[PDB]
Design a protein around this ligand. Structure first.
Ligand SMILES: [Zn+2]
Ligand SMILES: [Zn+2]
Ligand SMILES: [Zn+2]
Ligand SMILES: [Zn+2]
Length: 547
């Protein structure tokens, strides 16, 4: 029953201060006519004919009761007023049908309150005056989390202030109490910029930023593109196709590929926001037919908060066109896209999309890729592109073993169904002609210069979806996506599986204490090499060995 605490520099509010600040908002509700009228007195179920009411609404609340408390002085902190206005709204929204008068009255009162209470609560030193709950995820909704300033005691929305103890382990200090300090907040070192770079990531981001510079739009921020996971996998031929082609030795039992997960982030309001993500499968020059030198885009997802909107599509295209150009240069021959719009509520990569992010009609989605590919053809990056059906006929395919066979793809499961219902494949291909693109990119072996990044969280799409569902990292709004990115990036920086050995770029020996180049992407010399091999750039001394 007993809980002790200390809080000397606490913000404490005197009644009159609140009223002078708060009640101009409670009055803006009373001024709503006729909408405020059912809310000026406690709901009387015996006047209205609804004995129902007190069984459904457990804590009645209304304007008059709130006006009393604001005059009684019963509100010590400003959140208690705000909690009571939202309690009023939540009662009405609950009991009444979304079509009734009162429910629509309520949404008008609430829209007014949102506009009034935000600037006021911010003048009192808070983030906003909203009540937030996370999307459904029964009956219950989970409440957003709060942080208290270790100085003020002012309760804040953790998502509003974007505070996380891992980044700032000495705790949350509100922006004003930091002004009573001179020193600003410490830098967030768990940023997108600071994710390990790759030639693949760099080529894509170098291409997006070069485009954004020519655009010179003032709302735009820097784009960071990062490969965050890669590994070597195999796809096993399924049992039907196995007995039909593997036992004879016409198809290999499994096909090797390298999978990669990559994300793009944009600077928006000075923080990292993840707006684009993609998993790919890459079948090299030692992969047997039919997968030799082929890349396939398994899953592609996006969140529409990129700034500005009028550049969103062009930047998605720049990443995709950049991916084709990159693997074309390394030696891949064909690319494949499965252009399928999500089945409402299926999140491809990011948990919980914005309610008003458009799910495109399949004709629009395919036109979208067509425009991207047409753009690539124009720049002479693509040699040509056709749908799977027109392409199969043009190559005179007659056997199922000539269809590329990719992990998790549509066609391996169509082939299993065909074999199981045998006792028309060209018909199924024409039927879904529009959904499957075949991209012609064009030799010595393919050698990927990037190393593998072990990151279980991004080894395929399920691990990150699950973690975001459990942690309520939604991408449903700009403010929630900012928070989700923040924590996503903390997970990549600190919970990955790679540990780093350092070698001298000259004699290749393992180093502890070392000279690290300030200019080159990643260049080191042991003490001995620093003492013999000249390097023209300034170098700094890093590490500290125990011998
Ligand atoms: Zn807030
Ligand atoms: Zn504070
Ligand atoms: Zn050396
Ligand atoms: Zn250098």
């Amino acid at each position: 029953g007993a809980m002790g605490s200390s809080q000397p520099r606490k913000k404490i509010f005197k009644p009159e201060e609140l009223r002078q600040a708060l009640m101009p908002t409670l009055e803006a509700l009373y001024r709503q006519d006729p909408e405020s009228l059912p809310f000026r007195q406690p709901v009387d179920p015996q006047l209205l004919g609804i004995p129902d009411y007190f069984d459904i609404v457990k804590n009645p609340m209304d304007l008059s009761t709130i006006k009393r408390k604001l005059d009684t002085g019963q509100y010590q902190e400003p959140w208690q007023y705000v909690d009571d206005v939202w309690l009023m709204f939540n009662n009405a929204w609950l009991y009444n049908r979304k079509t009734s008068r009162v429910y629509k009255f309520c949404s008008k009162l609430a829209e007014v309150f949102e506009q009034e209470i935000d600037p006021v609560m911010q003048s009192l030193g808070y983030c906003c005056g909203r009540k937030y709950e996370f999307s459904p995820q029964n009956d219950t909704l989970d409440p957003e989390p709060f942080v208290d300033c270790k100085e003020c005691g002012r309760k804040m929305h953790q998502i509003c202030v974007l505070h996380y103890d891992i980044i700032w382990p000495s705790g949350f200090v509100c922006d004003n109490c930091l002004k009573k300090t001179g020193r600003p907040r410490k830098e967030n070192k768990f940023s997108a910029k600071r994710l390990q770079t790759t030639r693949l990531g760099n080529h894509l981001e170098d291409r997006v930023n070069k485009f954004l510079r020519r655009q010179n739009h003032p709302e735009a921020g820097e784009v960071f593109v990062r490969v965050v996971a890669s590994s070597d996998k195999t796809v096993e031929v399924k049992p039907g196709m196995k007995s039909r082609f593997v036992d004879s030795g016409e198809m290999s039992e499994s096909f090797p590929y390298r999978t990669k997960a990559l994300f793009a982030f944009e600077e928006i309001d000075g923080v990292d926001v993840c707006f684009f993500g993609m998993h790919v499968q890459e079948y090299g020059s030692d992969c047997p037919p039919p997968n030799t030198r082929r890349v396939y885009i398994s899953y592609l997802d996006s969140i529409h908060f990129f700034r500005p909107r009028c550049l969103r599509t062009a930047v998605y295209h720049e990443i995709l066109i950049g991916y084709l150009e990159y693997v074309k240069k390394l030696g891949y021959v064909t690319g494949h896209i499965w252009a399928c719009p999500p089945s409402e509520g299926d999140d491809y990569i990011f948990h919980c999309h914005p309610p008003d992010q458009k799910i495109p009609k399949p004709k629009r989605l395919q036109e979208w890729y067509k425009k991207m590919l047409d753009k690539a053809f124009a720049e002479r990056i693509i040699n040509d592109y056709k749908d799977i059906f027109k392409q199969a006929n043009e190559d005179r395919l007659t056997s199922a073993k000539e269809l590329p066979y990719f992990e998790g793809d549509f066609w391996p499961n169509v082939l299993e169904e065909s074999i199981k219902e045998s006792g028309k494949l060209y018909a199924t291909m024409e039927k879904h002609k529009e959904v499957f693109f075949v991209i012609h990119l064009h030799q010595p072996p393919i050698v990927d210069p990037d190393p593998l990044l072990s990151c279980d969280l991004m080894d395929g799409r399920d691990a990150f979806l699950t973690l975001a569902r459990d942690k309520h990292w939604e991408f449903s709004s700009l403010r929630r996506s900012k928070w989700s990115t923040l924590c996503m990036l903390v997970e990549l920086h600190t919970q990955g599986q790679d540990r780093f050995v350092y070698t001298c770029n000259e004699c290749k020996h393992h180093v502890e204490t070392r000279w690290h180049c300030t200019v080159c992407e990643d260049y080191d010399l042991c003490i001995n090499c620093y003492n013999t091999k000249s390097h023209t750039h300034k170098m700094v001394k890093w590490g500290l060995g125990l011998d």
